[PDB]
Amino acid sequence: SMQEEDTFRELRIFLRNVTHRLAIDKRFRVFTKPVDPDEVPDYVTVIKQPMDLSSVISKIDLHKYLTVKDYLRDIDLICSNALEYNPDRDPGDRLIRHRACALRDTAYAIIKEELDEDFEQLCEEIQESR
């Protein structure tokens, strides 16, 4: 229905706003673009589902997220990919894991404060009726 399309459009607007606030945070610069296969050639072989914030924006626009849960799955993937690919005790690895966890925590905290639970519930029920 048109009421339902308005609901998903409002969701996309909200998700673009959250994603932009993540993307402009200096700590998360490393997560803003896909990992370049020329800087890191074995990445695409080790990490099976690469994800980054520019891809998240593309997916919003492709209407791939019908709920905030779908969205957080990809935020979580950004974080878990970083933990998996950089597991070592060295400070370069520890810095990116700390940033990855911060990205994840920050996104969840924005959503906890700013997403109305009834709005999410409506998105889920429309999505389940399809």
Ligand SMILES: Cc1cc2c(cc1N)n(C)c(=O)n2C
């Ligand atoms: C150069 C670079 C390396 C990365 C990276 C981003 C960049 N830009 N990420 C997200 C990652 O896990 N690694 C090892």
Ligand SMILES: [Cl-]
């Ligand atoms: Cl840096």
Ligand SMILES: [Cl-]
């Ligand atoms: Cl997909």
Ligand SMILES: [Cl-]
């Ligand atoms: Cl640790």
Ligand SMILES: [Cl-]
């Ligand atoms: Cl909202």
